[PDB]
Amino acid sequence: EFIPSNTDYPGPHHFEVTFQQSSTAKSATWTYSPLLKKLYCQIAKTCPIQIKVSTPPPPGTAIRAMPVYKKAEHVTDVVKRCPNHELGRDFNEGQSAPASHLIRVEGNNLSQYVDDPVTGRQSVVVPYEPPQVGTEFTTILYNFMCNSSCVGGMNRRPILIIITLEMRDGQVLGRRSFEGRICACPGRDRKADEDHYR
Amino acid sequence: EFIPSNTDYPGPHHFEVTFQQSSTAKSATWTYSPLLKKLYCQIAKTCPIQIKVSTPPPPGTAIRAMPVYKKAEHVTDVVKRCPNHELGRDFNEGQSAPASHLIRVEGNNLSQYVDDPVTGRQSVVVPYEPPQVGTEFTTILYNFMCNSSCVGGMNRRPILIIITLEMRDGQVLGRRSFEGRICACPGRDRKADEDHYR
Amino acid sequence: EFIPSNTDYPGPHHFEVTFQQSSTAKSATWTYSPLLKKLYCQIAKTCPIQIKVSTPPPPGTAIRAMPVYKKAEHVTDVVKRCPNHELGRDFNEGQSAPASHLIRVEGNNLSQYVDDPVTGRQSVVVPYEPPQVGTEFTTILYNFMCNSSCVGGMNRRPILIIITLEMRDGQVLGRRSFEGRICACPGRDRKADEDHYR
Amino acid sequence: EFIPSNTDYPGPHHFEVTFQQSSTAKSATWTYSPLLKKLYCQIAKTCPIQIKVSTPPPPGTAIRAMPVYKKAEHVTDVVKRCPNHELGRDFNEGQSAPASHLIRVEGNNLSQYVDDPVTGRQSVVVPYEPPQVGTEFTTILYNFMCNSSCVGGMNRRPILIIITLEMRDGQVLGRRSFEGRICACPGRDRKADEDHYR
DNA sequence: GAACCGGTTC
DNA sequence: GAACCGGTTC
DNA sequence: GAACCGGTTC
DNA sequence: GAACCGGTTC
Ligand SMILES: [Zn+2]
Ligand SMILES: [Zn+2]
Ligand SMILES: [Zn+2]
Ligand SMILES: [Zn+2]
């Protein structure tokens, strides 16, 4: 509970998370690599994800997004927004999301922003909502409010964003995860990591 | 309910929406592309649509027109009229439609203009009326009160206009949708998008 | 007093207005062509001018900037900021100067933005200051708050910016003028008009 | 008094500012190019300057350093430390000098950091001291507390550091100036700009 | 110090 | 989108 | 900065 | 309807 675990766990109610097709254009505001499981996004731009289920009934259950550093040494640094932005003008005046928080949800007002008093981890939870009438989809709109590259926060040390499905008491029914990179050029970053790997 | 769903849904009372033939002339005030499902219209000019039914009886039921941005990032921006028009002279003095609204209905005085107090979405609903004695047709006259290209509103980010058929309690019995583009030259825009695609 | 005169007028003090050399790079934030006597600048960016005089004072003199339309038919529309600029966030909240004004002054706190209660012309007046010791001219930082290209205000009808040096009682002691253009690309625009006269 | 003059001004005492030879090694903590009159230094490292005068006093004279932006459009933003520097641990706790200030003085306890309550310009003043016996110049140790490269404060718009020698009542007796650049690599940066003029 | 990256401008 | 810049890696 | 689009004039 | 213009995209 004190240290987040970072392993894929479908659990008994299969938990699956996918992405509608993202542009293969260099100008896309966000894009996901199925080869690497890496999300490339831009600051403050909605990158939506779809969580999908086939056996959706538990009660009052929610989904958490919790950012974590992959590399061992900072893993004990609470991930947060690096000092100029948490405190800049451009995205501080608008929401009730804590200025200190890295991850926001944009289309949901039943969002609960958690800053753990004991562990200090900050994450964002939404109540589970079945899809809108008739199909796999259920969209959550995330907003990333800083770069991976930023001074004071991640400082160019890549982070995995872990999404967990949880019962009201916190017990995990499903969880999946992938690493996220928040640069000013996700289409170019997508192509490059992939180039070096092949 | 907070985020509009944008998928075609005929529903149990088949819901179908069509267009009488529009000019293939470059001077047409409006025109629809069956290939792309894209409506090209001009500011403030009546572009009528026909909704048709074969099994028309529910009670007090209505049809909604609700504009939505297609692209993910603004989808959380309430679609509205960009600051010079909501506030210009030319179409503000005339109707009780809210100056802030993008979509109006012209031949109907039982129009109810909804500005959601909770979600903030603005849409226009009319009570369902059977056709005038004897044929498929039932016309609704829409007026688009700003360009897609306009500064402050859509700002050149294309929007889909979703028409839903709803019972008095709001439950959807039919819905269909298509993307709309509101330029100063719909005949030319029709020909061009279509050129690039083929 | 009701319709402004639009002619250059050297004073007893030989009022002259000049501009420092501006980068001729297209990336310049503003550039004047001495040839056509017209200023090209960018929205909201500081655009300083040079006044030079042969003698000083007399006590209490001021300098006014008042924009006026060159075409005969618009001259009776008071020239003001367009409704989209007038009502936005970017520069209305941070300023104490009235929002309807096209012309602002930067770094000067005794600026008086005159909105004639009677004629309605808007201008900005500062008290005359002799130059800083040993310099030839006192710089004034203007800010132009709408583009020539703008909808609702100036609307693509070119403007002359009239600069008058006047005693407290209003009599004109010096006068000069130039036509002003406020686009989003001043190096290119300057270059294109210059290409066009020949 | 409201907008600073940005011109070199020898006083009655022939105020001159020079710099000792700096290692030309790229490992130098700071290096000035006499050719371009611009200083290259490193964050938080002592960067001393030489003043020379032809005559002393008169009683009670002081020396001010005030940074000001070279580009016209930023000149009205008060130049200060960027929020990341302003609020950190490395140099805020150990110093009694105000954190918002770009310029600090080392080893001098009667330094007065002036934050104009009225104009808001920040500068640092020390009383003039004649040189130590038999030396030509009195050294002042400045510390620059944000990089030119910094986010939120200076943000990659070059700065002139204005050094003025002034009587207690504020009148300027001498003046000199240079453009300042505070990067993480001064020998290389100096060398690159110098390569570039020719 | 030379080589690298990743945000910024043209 | 390409070329440039400037702190960081090693 | 060059190339693109989409509203405006001739 | 064709040619021009001028902020925006990339
Ligand atoms: Zn940041
Ligand atoms: Zn509009
Ligand atoms: Zn305007
Ligand atoms: Zn800083």
* Alpha carbon distance A104, A124 (integer Å): 7
d(CA B41, CA B159): 12
* Residue A196 DSSP SS3: helix
Task: Report the alpha-carbon distance of residue D96 to residue D79 in Å, rounded.
Answer: 20
Determine the Cα–Cα distance for residues B96 and B88; give it in Å rounded to an integer: 15
Whether D71 CB is under 7 Å from strand F: no
Task: Identify all chain D residues contacting C97, using CB atoms and an 8 Å cutoff.
Answer: none
Chains A & D: contacts with CB separation below 8 Å: 17
- Evaluate the CA torsion angle D44, D47, D48, D50 in order and state its sign: negative
CB A89 within 8 A of CB A83: no
Rounded Cα gap, residues B138 and D197, in angstroms: 74
Binding-site positions of B read 82, 85, 146, 150
Render A92-110 in DSSP notation, one character per residue.
TSS-SS-TT-SEEESS-SS
Q: What is the CA B22 to chain-centroid distance, rounded?
A: 17
Number of other CB atoms surrounding residue A110 within 10 Å? 11
Contact B28, B183 (CB under 8 A): no
User: For residue C8, which of C179, C189, C184 has the smallest C-alpha distance?
Assistant: C179
Spatial separation of the C-alpha atoms in residues D154 and A29, rounded to whole Å: 28
Separation of B94 CA from ligand 4 center, angstroms? 54
Q: How far apart are CA A23 and CA A2, in angstroms?
A: 38
| H-helix or E-strand spanning residue C166 | strand C159-166
Identify which of A124, A196, A117 has the alpha carbon closest to the alpha carbon of residue A166.
A124
Q: Which of A45, A46, A108 sits opposite B2 (nearest CB)?
A: A108
Task: Tell how many helices (H) and how many strands (E) occur in chain D.
Answer: 2, 11
Tell me: cis bond preceding C58? Omega within 30 of 0 counts.
Answer: yes
* Structure tokens given for D22: 């700096």
Which residue in this structure is represented by tokens 């293939």?
B24
Cβ atoms within 10 Å of B23's Cβ, excluding its own: 12
* C-beta of residue B41 within 8 angstroms of C-beta of residue B144: yes
Checking each nucleotide's C1' against the CA of B188, the nearest proves to be: H1
CB within 8 A of D183, min separation 6: which ones? D40, D42, D147, D148, D149, D189
Domain annotation for chain D: domains and CATH numbers: 1-198 (2.60.40.720)
C1’ G3 / CA A44, Å: 28
The DSSP bridge pattern shows strands D172-182 and D38-41 to be parallel
Q: Give the tokens for residue D151.
A: 């986010």
φ and ψ at residue D32, rounded to 5 degrees: -100, 135
Q: Which residues contact B102 (CB under 8 A, 6 or more apart)?
A: B67, B79, B80, B81, B122, B144, B145, B146, B153
Query: In this structure, are strands B103-105 and B112-115 parallel, antiparallel, or unpaired?
Result: unpaired
Residue pair C68/C75 in contact (Cβ under 8 Å)? The answer is yes
Taking the C-alpha atoms of residue C44 and residue C92, their distance in angstroms, rounded to an integer, is: 11
Q: Is the CB of C26 under 7 A from strand G?
A: yes
Compute the CA torsion angle A155, A157, A163, A169 (nearest 10 deg): -70
Reading phi first (left if > 0) and then psi (alpha if -120 to 50, else beta), residue B152 is in left
B151 and C82 in contact by Cβ < 8 A?
no
Q: Tell me the backbone φ, ψ of residue B194, rounded to 5 degrees.
A: -65, -40
DSSP conformation letters of D60-123:
T-EEEEEEEESSTTTTTSPP---HHHHH-STTTSS--S-TT-SEEEES-TT-EEEE-TTT--EE
Strand segments (E) across A60-185: 62-69, 103-105, 112-115, 122-127, 139-144, 159-166, 172-182
What is the spatial distance between Cα A129 and Cα D154, in angstroms, rounded to a whole number?
46
H or E element that contains C193: helix C186-197
Helix (H) or strand (E) holding C167: none
Whether a cis peptide bond, with omega within 30° of 0, leads into D58 is yes
Interface D:B, ≥3 CB–CB pairs < 8 Å = no
Nearest-neighbour CA in chain D from A129: distance (Å): 39
Amino acid letter, residue D83: P
- The rounded distance, in Å, linking the Cα atoms of C69 and B180 is 38
Tokens of A198: 């092949």
- Pairwise CA distance, residues D50 & D161, whole Å: 14
Give which of B82, B84, B146, B154 to mutate to test C binding, by max C Cβ within 10 Å.
B84
Please indicate if the annotation marks C196 as binding a ligand: no
**Residues A107, B2: C-beta atoms closer than 8 Å:** yes
Q: Of C193, C192, C164, C191, give the one whose Cα is nearest residue C178.
A: C164
Experimental structure resolution, Å: 4.0
Q: Taking the CA atoms of chain A, what radius of gyration do you get in angstroms?
A: 16
Burial class (CB in 10 A: 0-12, 13-18, 19+), C27: exposed
Q: What single letter denotes the amino acid at residue B56?
A: P
Q: What is the chain D residue with the closest CA to C23? A: D71
Which residues are near ligand 3, the ion (C-beta closer than 5 Å)? C 82, 85, 146, 150, 153
Cβ-count burial A168-180 (b if 16+ within 10 Å, e if not): eeeeebbbbbbbb
Residue type, C124: V
Contact B2, A127 (CB under 8 A): no
Q: A139, A105 in Cβ contact below 8 A?
A: no
Closest CA to C164 of C64, C49, C40, C48: C64
Distance, in Å, from the CA atom of D154 to the CA atom of D81, rounded to the nearest integer, reads 7
From edge to edge, which strands make up the β-sheet containing B112-115? B30-33, B38-41, B172-182, B159-166, B62-69, B122-127, B112-115
Nearest nucleotide by C1' position to the D182 CA atom = F6
Q: Is the CB of A168 under 7 A from strand F?
A: no
Of C45, C108, C134, the CB nearest to D73: C45
Residue A189, helix vs strand vs coil = helix
**Within chain A, what is the greatest distance between any pair of CA atoms?**
45
| Amino acid residing at D137 | F
3-state secondary structure chain B: CCCCCCCCECCCCCCEEECCCCCCCCCCCEEEECCCCEEEECCCCEEEEEEECCCCCCCCCEEEEEEEECCHHHCCCCCCCCHHHHCCCCCCCCCCCCCCCCEEECCCCCCEEEECCCCCCEEEEEECCCCCCCCCCCEEEEEECCCCCCCCCCCCCCEEEEEEEECCCCCEEEEEEEEEEECCCHHHHHHHHHHHHC
Distance of alpha carbon D113 from alpha carbon D103, whole angstroms: 9
Residue of D nearest to C43 (CA): D73
Between CA D46 and CA D37 the distance in angstroms is 19
Are residues A51 and A17 in contact, defined by beta-carbon separation less than 8 angstroms?
yes
Element (DSSP H or E) covering residue C194: helix C186-197
* Separation CA C83–CA B83 (nearest Å): 7
Secondary structure tally for chain A: helices H, strands E: 2, 11
Chain C residues with CB inside 8 Å of B87's CB? Answer: 83, 87
User: Which chain A residue has its CA at the smallest distance from D151's CA?
Assistant: A84
**B173 phi, psi to nearest 5 deg:** -100, -20
